[PDB]
Amino acid sequence: GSSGSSGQAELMTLTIVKGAQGFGFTIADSPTGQRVKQILDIQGCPGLCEGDLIVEINQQNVQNLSHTEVVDILKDCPIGSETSLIIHRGSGPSSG
């Protein structure tokens, strides 16, 4: 790669816990990466707001990852333990 542009943001890490069934929320393949389909356990995903956009799981890069690749990483995750996800938010500053 070469590139030669700049452009930067500050993305939200949130923390989640892997109950038994593979968290208490579901995912969907979107044109933009994986998204939250639906939350099924609020404290299974404290701070998740649905339709948010998966970018990193435990600092692994998963934007360009297929649905399966993201599911697999969430399978690698330990049950009952924390997992740290990073989602897409904050285009620019305004009244927030």
Cβ neighbours for 84, distance < 8 A, ≥ 6 positions apart: 13, 14, 15, 16, 57, 58, 59
CB 46 within 8 A of CB 14: yes
CB 20 within 8 A of CB 30: no
CB 96 within 8 A of CB 21: no
- What DSSP string describes the chain? -----------EEEEEE--SSSSSEEEEEETTEEEEEEES-GGGSTT--SS-EEEEETTEE-SS--HHHHHHHHHHSPTTSEEEEEEE--SS-S--
Separation CA 72–CA 58 (nearest Å): 13
Question: Residue 76, by phi and psi: left (phi above 0), alpha (psi -120 to 50) or beta?
Answer: alpha
Separation CA 25–CA 43 (nearest Å): 10
Separation CA 21–CA 63 (nearest Å): 23
CB 57 within 8 A of CB 83: yes
Longest dimension (CA), the chain: 45
CB 23 within 8 A of CB 16: yes
- Domain 1-96 belongs in CATH node 1.10.760.10: no
How many other CB atoms sit within 10 Å of the CB of residue 29? Answer: 13
